[PDB]
Design an enzyme around this catalytic site. Structure first.
Site, PDB file in Angstrom:
ATOM      1  N   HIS A  55       0.830  -1.200   0.000  1.00 52.63           N
ATOM      2  CA  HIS A  55       0.000   0.000   0.000  1.00 52.63           C
ATOM      3  C   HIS A  55       0.868   1.254   0.000  1.00 52.63           C
ATOM      4  O   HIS A  55       0.649   2.194   0.765  1.00 52.63           O
ATOM      5  CB  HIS A  55      -0.969  -0.027   1.178  1.00 52.63           C
ATOM      6  CG  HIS A  55      -1.897  -1.200   1.156  1.00 52.63           C
ATOM      7  ND1 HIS A  55      -2.019  -2.073   2.213  1.00 52.63           N
ATOM      8  CD2 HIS A  55      -2.736  -1.652   0.194  1.00 52.63           C
ATOM      9  CE1 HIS A  55      -2.901  -3.009   1.908  1.00 52.63           C
ATOM     10  NE2 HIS A  55      -3.351  -2.776   0.688  1.00 52.63           N
ATOM     11  N   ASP A 195      -1.891   1.390  -8.520  1.00 50.00           N
ATOM     12  CA  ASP A 195      -2.996   1.094  -9.419  1.00 50.00           C
ATOM     13  C   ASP A 195      -3.891   2.308  -9.656  1.00 50.00           C
ATOM     14  O   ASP A 195      -4.071   3.172  -8.793  1.00 50.00           O
ATOM     15  CB  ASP A 195      -3.827  -0.082  -8.895  1.00 50.00           C
ATOM     16  CG  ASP A 195      -4.065  -0.020  -7.407  1.00 50.00           C
ATOM     17  OD1 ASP A 195      -3.598   0.940  -6.764  1.00 50.00           O
ATOM     18  OD2 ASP A 195      -4.713  -0.947  -6.880  1.00 50.00           O
ATOM     19  N   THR A 252     -14.049  -4.294  -4.148  1.00 49.20           N
ATOM     20  CA  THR A 252     -15.133  -4.657  -3.236  1.00 49.20           C
ATOM     21  C   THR A 252     -16.453  -4.218  -3.857  1.00 49.20           C
ATOM     22  O   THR A 252     -16.917  -3.096  -3.639  1.00 49.20           O
ATOM     23  CB  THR A 252     -14.918  -4.022  -1.867  1.00 49.20           C
ATOM     24  OG1 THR A 252     -15.331  -2.649  -1.901  1.00 49.20           O
ATOM     25  CG2 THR A 252     -13.451  -4.098  -1.480  1.00 49.20           C
TER      26      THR A 252
END
Length: 484
Positions: A55, A195, A252
């Site tokens: 991250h 990303d 998600t």
């Protein structure tokens, strides 16, 4: 709005037009996270991104910027002391966590990436140091504690810290590459960039019945009472919408919207992209360890504009004029937080993130009935705070929007007080619950002023003595507010 978002964001221009066709097709607002031009040189190159193993983020300068490298000095951890090693122990822990597709390789790049910042006016390439039996291209940067070194005939950045001076991370190493992990797609090299991301997703109201099956929607039209007609959009969509799949692969979304995002990510293939999954997880606030609040938000409307916002105070109007303040869909990111106090799940996040400071709390590892009844009473907190941020309310008039959006706020505050009506709880939660009761008093107040109610909240709370029913103790909350 249009021109001002295409120039300043730094995205790929032809793929935002490729997202535009589906917006005319399926009537969708597609929110986005701003990513810079240094990353989208690689997005227009055809390389795939990372998942959610590491991250880190995209560096503001660099031919290796936009990536998630081995050493996090060449990324968002720029100017930190321990986070540049706490992030260096993060991607090296992605080796022994997501193993099966995590590799170990130098970066994939071109030789023309050294002239990317020469025309940007960022880095100054100076003296040239000779090693490897080769006239080698040593070059400097803005920081003198880290300098890049890219070969003249290769694509490797065989950089180093300057050997005459000290490393700020604490290491000591010579001219060396970045051993970024790869995505081993059929063996083809594709290292991990930061990303291309999202911010939310919001189709029109019409495509809900056309996505989820209308075999049960032909039964909510066969319902006589209007309040229980809104139970048909409630329970059918709880088992359909909020049944997420929080993973590290695609995003998600539920199975009626996860099927839609790959359609949004296939229009890039025939018009510029060749690397497949360029969007690999959800929002900015879908960093599942801590949320990241922003000011800059990109969105393409169902008609084809590049809408640019400036502050969230404008976006809180842009939510309350387009997203929730219109006949549209509120699929959001799951004392002056004037519209958005954080979620029930983030209250569940803020539940644990203060009891890890001190032991004494509301309910602990015990066996008393009062402790689990307080766990049973915080069950009604999160279940009623879900209908606060819920788009099941625009089906009727916008009065019925704002009616139930604070009816739960009344319905939670009595249960909040019933949590406060307990023993002498320690002030790591009790004074945290004073922060709970004050802002819920505030957001009902601003709603009641924007509406034509003209009542104080404390007067109305003593009117609503609801024991257990909503079949009449919403109706006596209705009949006080409506018909006027």
């Amino acid at each position: 709005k249009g021109e001002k978002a295409l120039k300043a964001s730094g995205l790929v221009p032809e793929h935002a037009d490729a997202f535009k066709k589906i917006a005319r097709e399926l009537n969708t607002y597609i929110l986005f996270r701003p990513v810079n031009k240094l990353a989208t040189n690689l997005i227009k190159s055809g390389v795939a991104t990372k998942g959610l193993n590491v991250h880190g983020k995209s560096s503001d300068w660099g031919p290796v910027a936009g990536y998630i490298p081995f050493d996090q000095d060449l990324s968002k951890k720029h100017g930190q002391q321990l986070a540049v090693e706490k992030g260096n122990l993060e991607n090296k822990k992605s080796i022994t966590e997501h193993e099966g597709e995590i590799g170990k390789i130098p970066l994939k790049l071109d030789h023309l990436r050294i002239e990317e910042l020469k025309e940007n006016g960022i880095i100054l390439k100076g003296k040239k140091e000779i090693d490897n039996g080769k006239k080698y291209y040593l070059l400097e940067s803005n920081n003198q504690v880290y300098e890049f070194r890219i070969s003249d005939e290769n694509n490797e950045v065989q950089y180093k810290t300057k050997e005459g001076k000290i490393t700020v991370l604490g290491e000591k190493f010579n001219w060396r590459n970045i051993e970024v992990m790869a995505k081993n797609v059929e063996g083809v090299l594709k290292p991990l960039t930061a990303d291309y991301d999202l911010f939310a997703l919001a189709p029109s109201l019409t495509e809900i019945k056309k996505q989820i099956p209308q075999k049960e929607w032909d039964k909510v039209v066969n319902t006589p009472n209007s309040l229980e007609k809104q139970k048909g959009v409630t329970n059918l969509l709880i088992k359909y919408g909020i049944e997420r799949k929080p993973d590290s692969t695609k995003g998600t979304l539920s199975n009626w919207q996860k099927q839609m995002l790959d359609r949004l990510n296939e229009a890039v293939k025939y018009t510029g992209y060749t690397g497949g999954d360029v969007v690999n997880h959800g929002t900015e606030q879908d960093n599942e360890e801590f949320p990241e609040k922003d000011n800059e938000i990109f969105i393409i409307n169902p008609e084809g504009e590049f809408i640019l916002t400036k502050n969230w105070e404008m976006t809180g109007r842009f939510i309350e004029k387009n997203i929730t303040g219109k006949d549209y869909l509120y699929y959001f990111n799951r004392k002056a937080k004037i519209n958005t106090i954080p979620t029930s799940a983030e209250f569940i996040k803020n539940l644990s993130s203060i009891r890890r400071s001190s032991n004494v709390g509301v309910y602990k590892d015990s066996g008393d009935k009062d402790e689990f009844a307080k766990k049973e009473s915080v069950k009604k907190i999160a279940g009623y705070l879900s209908d606060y941020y819920n788009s099941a309310n625009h089906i009727f008039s916008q009065e019925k929007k704002r009616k139930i959006s604070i009816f739960r706020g009344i319905q939670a505050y009595n249960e909040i007080e019933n949590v406060l009506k307990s023993k002498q709880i320690a002030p790591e939660y009790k004074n945290y619950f004073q922060y709970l009761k004050e802002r819920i008093t505030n957001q009902v107040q601003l709603l009641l002023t924007h509406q034509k109610s003209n009542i104080e909240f404390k007067l109305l709370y003593k009117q609503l003595n609801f024991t257990e029913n909503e079949t009449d103790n919403f109706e006596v909350f209705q009949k006080i507010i409506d018909e006027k």
